[PDB]
Amino acid sequence: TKAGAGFKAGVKDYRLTYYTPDYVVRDTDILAAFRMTPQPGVPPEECGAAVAAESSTGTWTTVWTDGLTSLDRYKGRCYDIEPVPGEDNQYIAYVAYPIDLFEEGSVTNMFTSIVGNVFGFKALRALRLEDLRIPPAYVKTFVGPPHGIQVERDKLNKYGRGLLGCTIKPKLGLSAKNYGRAVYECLRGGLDFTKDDENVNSQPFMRWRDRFLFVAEAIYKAQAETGEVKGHYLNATAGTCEEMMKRAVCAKELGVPIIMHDYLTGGFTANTSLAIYCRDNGLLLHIHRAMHAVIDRQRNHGIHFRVLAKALRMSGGDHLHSGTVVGKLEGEREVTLGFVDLMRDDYVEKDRSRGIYFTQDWCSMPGVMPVASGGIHVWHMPALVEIFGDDACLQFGGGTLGHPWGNAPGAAANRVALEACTQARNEGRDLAREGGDVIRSACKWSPELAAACEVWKEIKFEFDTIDKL
Amino acid sequence: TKAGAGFKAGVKDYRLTYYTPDYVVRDTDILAAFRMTPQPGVPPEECGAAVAAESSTGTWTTVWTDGLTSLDRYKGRCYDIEPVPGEDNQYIAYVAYPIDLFEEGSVTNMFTSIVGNVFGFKALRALRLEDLRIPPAYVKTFVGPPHGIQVERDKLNKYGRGLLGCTIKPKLGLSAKNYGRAVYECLRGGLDFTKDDENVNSQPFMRWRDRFLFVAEAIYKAQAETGEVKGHYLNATAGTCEEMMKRAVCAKELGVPIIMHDYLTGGFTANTSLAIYCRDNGLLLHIHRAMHAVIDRQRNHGIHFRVLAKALRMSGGDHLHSGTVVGKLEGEREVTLGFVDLMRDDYVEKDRSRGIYFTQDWCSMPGVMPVASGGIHVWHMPALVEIFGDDACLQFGGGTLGHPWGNAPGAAANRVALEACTQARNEGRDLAREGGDVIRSACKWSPELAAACEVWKEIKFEFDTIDKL
Amino acid sequence: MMVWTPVNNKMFETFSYLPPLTDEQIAAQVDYIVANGWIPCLEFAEADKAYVSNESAIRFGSVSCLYYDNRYWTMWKLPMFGCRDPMQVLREIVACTKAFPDAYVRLVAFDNQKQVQIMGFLVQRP
Amino acid sequence: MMVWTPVNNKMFETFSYLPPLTDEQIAAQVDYIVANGWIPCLEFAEADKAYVSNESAIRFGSVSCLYYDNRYWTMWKLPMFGCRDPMQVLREIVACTKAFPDAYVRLVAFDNQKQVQIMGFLVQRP
Ligand SMILES: O=C(O)[C@@](O)(COP(=O)(O)O)[C@H](O)[C@H](O)COP(=O)(O)O
Ligand SMILES: O=C(O)[C@@](O)(COP(=O)(O)O)[C@H](O)[C@H](O)COP(=O)(O)O
Ligand SMILES: [Mg+2]
Ligand SMILES: [Mg+2]
């Protein structure tokens, strides 16, 4: 009649329950890789165990209610800790989370556990979530993207080259009718798409429904003129889900092909709802990642963009901005190639040289089209085609509306540059070595391209990278 | 017939348009204070101008469409740049945004401009939004909090002391009926509130509607037993807005007083919708700030919690976690006192010693109750009452469910400690100097308190602070 | 482990978990009211109206959220606007309890700038 | 500034903004199909069925989003499954255009692993 393990009140180390280095991960576990910087005097095992505990089942002192359930079944487990080379106080802590911890189909819930409270613990100095292994059994609980790359190309009837888009400029301050005027002139010159700026929602200078109607006129005029399917990402981003849905409904009722949403500033709950609406009504959904660099820029703290991209894939989006590598916003090449594969492909093997900490199996969830946008122009075209291949949308806002001859010629310049690079690649030319030659030849041929070539010839964006592997 | 200013294609410095050091800010302008770390070779004026431009009206090359509108009227303006003492490459850049740039009532829109893209620019190494001046003319476009502090106390009939709450533990893994059992035992001992953990939504081990019903039984049993109004924050956080609303509706239909939402992981669009629902149906709305430390922990990059708190005040919440200062999660005293005032008060003067960069006038928008939670116990009670005063909710999860005698005695211990400290303060005792004596006297009197006093006597959380002013 | 009784253990909000307030302790709370310039007021209820209840919700649709009967008690006279003398408050406690010796009686105080009750506790139980 | 004409300037998707493909340039695209192991296929349409249009939406409620008539063209024979010879593709281009000399004709190629058309361009305009 000896006593079994009972309730003992008081504080004990988290590592006694949550550091389990001999744990064999299950194929349904959600895995996290945390770059962890402990405070002085806090062992890495204890820090990793605290992160595991406080993102799963545990708090700061022993609770009696553990005994009513099975902590073995539910606890998050720090199962491995690696030193970070180059770093004397950074570790990669690996945490396994049983699939029962998560609400089916809810990115919101998954983030709330894994990143909800642990980043603020006094016992750590910095914490960065680098990667998540989303198992097939959890992937299958999500609707995911409304359409995905193959369906999108099939609906648009567009094959054999990158898609081309363009953000209308000035960001803010244009009227609805000037917005449509700019859109028509852009689309008619050869761009597949234009878009509302991420912060163009509904404002005193331009109310949303006015914009949607004039943009519809522009889409249909440019489509009739060119014979190519056109779209403009009309922004459904709003202050409330009711306003977001009213905007999506208006796009549906105008018969236009594509809307956009700012998934992080609007939020995952609203994004997932909008993605389901877009699936149910046949709208393409472009996702803008506004605010991501608040979270993902610094190497020591936050969440890497690859996790934000996985989360968007799950919540749902047909497009997601991927960065450009060569443009005005940061994105290192290898980092970017890694998360582009995580966005598009069905099965991505572990590859630490591209920041892929876990093998990821998407179990047939549609791929998300990467959108390369921001400070790019015609001379970047070879590099963009080389980096992304055909399954991407390349967007030129300033690179279209900054052309000296206006939007149609600006659009034509970009379309010619893209087609010339695509043709050259298909003919066997190496765009990484011959890209300048391809553009120079095309500039000599096309007057519209030549004007763009001259204006932006010396413009490059080359800075020290913060988000290094 | 001389030529006026026209369109000249090509790149020029952002500072030619967006650095305006002689600008007199208007009383309707939204002001931002950015802690900015430029790349080497980028003048602070140019970096500040880039931040202003790319969060308002500008892109990387000159666009012709500026001429159709008035950039003077709409442009964001970097109007002042201050050096940061102790820092050779940090500056505070101040940016003014015309009120016409923003969608009325939309925190989503405001963040999309101010923090949407500028944090990822290659030309800066780090960027942190420290503060926002929200002018009365923009504040008045928001519904704001459903009820706010005065109305909440009036609905609950609770006056003259801090409110007391408690998160149920284990975080995850309890069944619905065990959740209700724990809740009843907590509430009946003297806690005003219990709550779902932030990550308790709906899961295989416990489906939400089952929990809501058993929690209703527990609330009503504890209320009938004690004669004091009771509540339990039932989590409406969900994967989709439809699921979020279904959960809010069930709480409405059970007649219970309070629900909760994870505003950052659920997102501002869903939060604002839920706050409006709570206003329309008389539910109190507790806001959990899960994920905030992903954004707000580091001094050099992200968004300070005071801005996240202002944003929540605008979107709407009756409660918001404020940190504890003394518990397991970080929150420096002066920093915290500053944003507590920004959460509760009508008018808060500039005070850089508490991180308040701008005078903030809330123009009668209800105050949000600060919730101090996380790693606190009875010995912290004097410090908590001293820091927050009566208008706060102090939450003891582990500090209740870790009591050696169970939840009712644990609740009683916390309620006695709070009442003893409140009485002592009202009698003229200085809680900052006499707090230990007050608790020691109360421990000698109350058996339930004495048990808590003994178990947690040596437990403190004292670490180097990352988020320093 | 001591068990917290569920039987005959109803509470009355602030200070109900402490020993019953002595006359000195009540006077100290009155001093705190006067020191902060708050408005003293007495309220009272017969036993049948002293405890929170739900009976009016029979008349409702699904709108009972944060509706309870018996939060309002009956005002003794008027709030003591302008009162800066603790002895006047104590005299009114005596007068109120003399007039209603079988009633629950509570002392409250109002802040007119927040426009909220800022303190309150029971001074008489039947 | 040159003005981009809106008049009689309809386009046919990939490679429409380049000079008309020479026979050498068409053969190079066929080589790329065969090098990557994609499935060549020819499609054709009379002029009245070659351009995207909207006439079937008269029969719809509010469900026209990403519905257009004339995205589908008519298949020439079958996709050339197993074809690893560019000369066979070129011979079929000749056969198709001989049979339908007034039709729009496009060469496409399919990837069966992505299950999507992976290239396409016009090879004949009436
Ligand atoms: O607001 C802007 O700057 C843009 O419209 C691009 O304008 P330009 O085409 O004129 O540069 C895009 O939203 C950014 O590309 C977003 O960044 P990211 O794609 O990195 O999320
Ligand atoms: O999950 C937790 O840890 C808690 O339930 C507290 O548990 P204990 O009461 O058992 O510590 C709260 O959610 C945290 O306080 C949130 O942090 P913050 O308030 O700083 O947002
Ligand atoms: Mg943009
Ligand atoms: Mg919690």
PDB file of N, CA, C and O in Angstrom, chain B residues 33-38 44 80-94 126-130 299-301 306 352 357 468-469:
ATOM      1  N   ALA B  33       6.233  57.826 -33.660  1.00  0.00           N
ATOM      2  CA  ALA B  33       7.612  57.920 -33.214  1.00  0.00           C
ATOM      3  C   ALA B  33       8.309  56.594 -33.497  1.00  0.00           C
ATOM      4  O   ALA B  33       7.984  55.581 -32.885  1.00  0.00           O
ATOM      5  N   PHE B  34       9.232  56.607 -34.446  1.00  0.00           N
ATOM      6  CA  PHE B  34       9.962  55.414 -34.833  1.00  0.00           C
ATOM      7  C   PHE B  34      11.397  55.443 -34.310  1.00  0.00           C
ATOM      8  O   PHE B  34      12.106  56.408 -34.589  1.00  0.00           O
ATOM      9  N   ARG B  35      11.800  54.393 -33.611  1.00  0.00           N
ATOM     10  CA  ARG B  35      13.215  54.195 -33.297  1.00  0.00           C
ATOM     11  C   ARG B  35      13.869  53.517 -34.497  1.00  0.00           C
ATOM     12  O   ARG B  35      13.606  52.365 -34.823  1.00  0.00           O
ATOM     13  N   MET B  36      14.715  54.272 -35.184  1.00  0.00           N
ATOM     14  CA  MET B  36      15.215  53.872 -36.499  1.00  0.00           C
ATOM     15  C   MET B  36      16.719  53.664 -36.471  1.00  0.00           C
ATOM     16  O   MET B  36      17.461  54.482 -35.928  1.00  0.00           O
ATOM     17  N   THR B  37      17.166  52.560 -37.048  1.00  0.00           N
ATOM     18  CA  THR B  37      18.586  52.248 -37.170  1.00  0.00           C
ATOM     19  C   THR B  37      18.949  52.133 -38.647  1.00  0.00           C
ATOM     20  O   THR B  37      18.702  51.106 -39.273  1.00  0.00           O
ATOM     21  N   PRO B  38      19.529  53.184 -39.218  1.00  0.00           N
ATOM     22  CA  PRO B  38      19.857  53.203 -40.634  1.00  0.00           C
ATOM     23  C   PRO B  38      21.016  52.290 -40.985  1.00  0.00           C
ATOM     24  O   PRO B  38      21.872  52.006 -40.144  1.00  0.00           O
ATOM     25  N   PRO B  44      20.253  59.873 -41.804  1.00  0.00           N
ATOM     26  CA  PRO B  44      19.048  59.729 -41.004  1.00  0.00           C
ATOM     27  C   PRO B  44      17.855  60.426 -41.629  1.00  0.00           C
ATOM     28  O   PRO B  44      16.729  59.921 -41.611  1.00  0.00           O
ATOM     29  N   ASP B  80      10.650  65.623 -37.720  1.00  0.00           N
ATOM     30  CA  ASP B  80      11.660  65.800 -36.677  1.00  0.00           C
ATOM     31  C   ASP B  80      12.431  64.502 -36.514  1.00  0.00           C
ATOM     32  O   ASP B  80      11.868  63.411 -36.670  1.00  0.00           O
ATOM     33  N   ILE B  81      13.723  64.598 -36.246  1.00  0.00           N
ATOM     34  CA  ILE B  81      14.587  63.462 -35.978  1.00  0.00           C
ATOM     35  C   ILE B  81      15.449  63.776 -34.751  1.00  0.00           C
ATOM     36  O   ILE B  81      16.134  64.800 -34.725  1.00  0.00           O
ATOM     37  N   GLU B  82      15.378  62.942 -33.726  1.00  0.00           N
ATOM     38  CA  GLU B  82      16.175  63.092 -32.515  1.00  0.00           C
ATOM     39  C   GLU B  82      17.208  61.976 -32.416  1.00  0.00           C
ATOM     40  O   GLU B  82      16.890  60.825 -32.697  1.00  0.00           O
ATOM     41  N   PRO B  83      18.432  62.283 -32.015  1.00  0.00           N
ATOM     42  CA  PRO B  83      19.396  61.272 -31.622  1.00  0.00           C
ATOM     43  C   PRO B  83      18.896  60.503 -30.409  1.00  0.00           C
ATOM     44  O   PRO B  83      18.106  61.025 -29.615  1.00  0.00           O
ATOM     45  N   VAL B  84      19.288  59.242 -30.287  1.00  0.00           N
ATOM     46  CA  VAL B  84      19.018  58.479 -29.068  1.00  0.00           C
ATOM     47  C   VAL B  84      20.293  58.422 -28.231  1.00  0.00           C
ATOM     48  O   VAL B  84      21.336  57.979 -28.701  1.00  0.00           O
ATOM     49  N   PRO B  85      20.220  58.968 -27.023  1.00  0.00           N
ATOM     50  CA  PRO B  85      21.350  58.968 -26.109  1.00  0.00           C
ATOM     51  C   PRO B  85      21.722  57.552 -25.706  1.00  0.00           C
ATOM     52  O   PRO B  85      20.852  56.717 -25.451  1.00  0.00           O
ATOM     53  N   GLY B  86      23.018  57.277 -25.731  1.00  0.00           N
ATOM     54  CA  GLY B  86      23.548  55.944 -25.501  1.00  0.00           C
ATOM     55  C   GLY B  86      23.744  55.194 -26.811  1.00  0.00           C
ATOM     56  O   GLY B  86      24.342  54.122 -26.838  1.00  0.00           O
ATOM     57  N   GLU B  87      23.208  55.736 -27.899  1.00  0.00           N
ATOM     58  CA  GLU B  87      23.174  55.088 -29.193  1.00  0.00           C
ATOM     59  C   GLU B  87      23.807  55.975 -30.264  1.00  0.00           C
ATOM     60  O   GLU B  87      23.373  57.110 -30.462  1.00  0.00           O
ATOM     61  N   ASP B  88      24.769  55.426 -30.993  1.00  0.00           N
ATOM     62  CA  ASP B  88      25.414  56.171 -32.065  1.00  0.00           C
ATOM     63  C   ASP B  88      24.732  55.984 -33.413  1.00  0.00           C
ATOM     64  O   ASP B  88      24.985  56.776 -34.329  1.00  0.00           O
ATOM     65  N   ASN B  89      23.819  55.022 -33.542  1.00  0.00           N
ATOM     66  CA  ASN B  89      23.161  54.785 -34.827  1.00  0.00           C
ATOM     67  C   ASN B  89      21.674  54.501 -34.654  1.00  0.00           C
ATOM     68  O   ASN B  89      21.049  53.815 -35.471  1.00  0.00           O
ATOM     69  N   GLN B  90      21.089  54.975 -33.562  1.00  0.00           N
ATOM     70  CA  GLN B  90      19.651  54.979 -33.378  1.00  0.00           C
ATOM     71  C   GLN B  90      19.134  56.412 -33.325  1.00  0.00           C
ATOM     72  O   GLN B  90      19.736  57.300 -32.729  1.00  0.00           O
ATOM     73  N   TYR B  91      18.015  56.639 -34.007  1.00  0.00           N
ATOM     74  CA  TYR B  91      17.351  57.927 -34.055  1.00  0.00           C
ATOM     75  C   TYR B  91      15.860  57.739 -33.771  1.00  0.00           C
ATOM     76  O   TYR B  91      15.315  56.681 -34.097  1.00  0.00           O
ATOM     77  N   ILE B  92      15.224  58.740 -33.181  1.00  0.00           N
ATOM     78  CA  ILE B  92      13.760  58.752 -33.168  1.00  0.00           C
ATOM     79  C   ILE B  92      13.302  59.637 -34.321  1.00  0.00           C
ATOM     80  O   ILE B  92      13.584  60.836 -34.328  1.00  0.00           O
ATOM     81  N   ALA B  93      12.663  59.027 -35.310  1.00  0.00           N
ATOM     82  CA  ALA B  93      12.083  59.754 -36.428  1.00  0.00           C
ATOM     83  C   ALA B  93      10.590  59.946 -36.167  1.00  0.00           C
ATOM     84  O   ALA B  93       9.878  58.982 -35.882  1.00  0.00           O
ATOM     85  N   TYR B  94      10.151  61.191 -36.253  1.00  0.00           N
ATOM     86  CA  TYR B  94       8.748  61.523 -36.035  1.00  0.00           C
ATOM     87  C   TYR B  94       8.064  61.745 -37.374  1.00  0.00           C
ATOM     88  O   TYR B  94       8.578  62.497 -38.208  1.00  0.00           O
ATOM     89  N   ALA B 126      17.074  48.123 -38.543  1.00  0.00           N
ATOM     90  CA  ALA B 126      16.093  47.847 -37.500  1.00  0.00           C
ATOM     91  C   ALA B 126      15.148  49.037 -37.416  1.00  0.00           C
ATOM     92  O   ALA B 126      15.516  50.168 -37.721  1.00  0.00           O
ATOM     93  N   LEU B 127      13.929  48.761 -36.980  1.00  0.00           N
ATOM     94  CA  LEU B 127      12.914  49.799 -36.852  1.00  0.00           C
ATOM     95  C   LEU B 127      11.947  49.378 -35.749  1.00  0.00           C
ATOM     96  O   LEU B 127      11.545  48.218 -35.740  1.00  0.00           O
ATOM     97  N   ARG B 128      11.646  50.301 -34.853  1.00  0.00           N
ATOM     98  CA  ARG B 128      10.665  50.016 -33.814  1.00  0.00           C
ATOM     99  C   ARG B 128       9.676  51.167 -33.697  1.00  0.00           C
ATOM    100  O   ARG B 128      10.082  52.317 -33.518  1.00  0.00           O
ATOM    101  N   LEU B 129       8.391  50.848 -33.791  1.00  0.00           N
ATOM    102  CA  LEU B 129       7.381  51.874 -33.547  1.00  0.00           C
ATOM    103  C   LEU B 129       7.170  52.008 -32.040  1.00  0.00           C
ATOM    104  O   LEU B 129       6.709  51.062 -31.412  1.00  0.00           O
ATOM    105  N   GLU B 130       7.535  53.156 -31.490  1.00  0.00           N
ATOM    106  CA  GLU B 130       7.484  53.364 -30.049  1.00  0.00           C
ATOM    107  C   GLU B 130       6.154  53.929 -29.582  1.00  0.00           C
ATOM    108  O   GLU B 130       5.698  53.585 -28.487  1.00  0.00           O
ATOM    109  N   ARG B 299      14.179  46.009 -27.886  1.00  0.00           N
ATOM    110  CA  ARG B 299      14.250  47.463 -27.890  1.00  0.00           C
ATOM    111  C   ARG B 299      14.525  48.055 -29.265  1.00  0.00           C
ATOM    112  O   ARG B 299      14.119  49.184 -29.542  1.00  0.00           O
ATOM    113  N   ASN B 300      15.207  47.307 -30.125  1.00  0.00           N
ATOM    114  CA  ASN B 300      15.662  47.845 -31.400  1.00  0.00           C
ATOM    115  C   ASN B 300      14.675  47.636 -32.536  1.00  0.00           C
ATOM    116  O   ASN B 300      14.818  48.293 -33.569  1.00  0.00           O
ATOM    117  N   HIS B 301      13.718  46.731 -32.410  1.00  0.00           N
ATOM    118  CA  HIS B 301      12.884  46.363 -33.551  1.00  0.00           C
ATOM    119  C   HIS B 301      11.528  45.869 -33.076  1.00  0.00           C
ATOM    120  O   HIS B 301      11.458  45.038 -32.171  1.00  0.00           O
ATOM    121  N   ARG B 306       2.889  49.622 -25.644  1.00  0.00           N
ATOM    122  CA  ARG B 306       1.969  50.753 -25.539  1.00  0.00           C
ATOM    123  C   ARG B 306       1.178  51.000 -26.822  1.00  0.00           C
ATOM    124  O   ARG B 306       0.021  51.424 -26.730  1.00  0.00           O
ATOM    125  N   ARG B 352       8.547  61.142 -21.311  1.00  0.00           N
ATOM    126  CA  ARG B 352       9.538  60.231 -21.874  1.00  0.00           C
ATOM    127  C   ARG B 352      10.150  59.299 -20.845  1.00  0.00           C
ATOM    128  O   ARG B 352      10.584  58.191 -21.176  1.00  0.00           O
ATOM    129  N   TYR B 357       5.660  59.169 -25.648  1.00  0.00           N
ATOM    130  CA  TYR B 357       6.339  60.084 -26.562  1.00  0.00           C
ATOM    131  C   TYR B 357       5.454  61.249 -26.968  1.00  0.00           C
ATOM    132  O   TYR B 357       5.922  62.295 -27.423  1.00  0.00           O
ATOM    133  N   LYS B 468      13.894  47.885 -22.097  1.00  0.00           N
ATOM    134  CA  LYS B 468      14.245  49.070 -21.338  1.00  0.00           C
ATOM    135  C   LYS B 468      13.966  50.326 -22.161  1.00  0.00           C
ATOM    136  O   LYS B 468      14.084  50.300 -23.386  1.00  0.00           O
ATOM    137  N   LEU B 469      13.616  51.419 -21.498  1.00  0.00           N
ATOM    138  CA  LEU B 469      13.236  52.650 -22.185  1.00  0.00           C
ATOM    139  C   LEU B 469      14.315  53.174 -23.119  1.00  0.00           C
ATOM    140  O   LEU B 469      15.510  53.057 -22.757  1.00  0.00           O
TER     141      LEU B 469
END
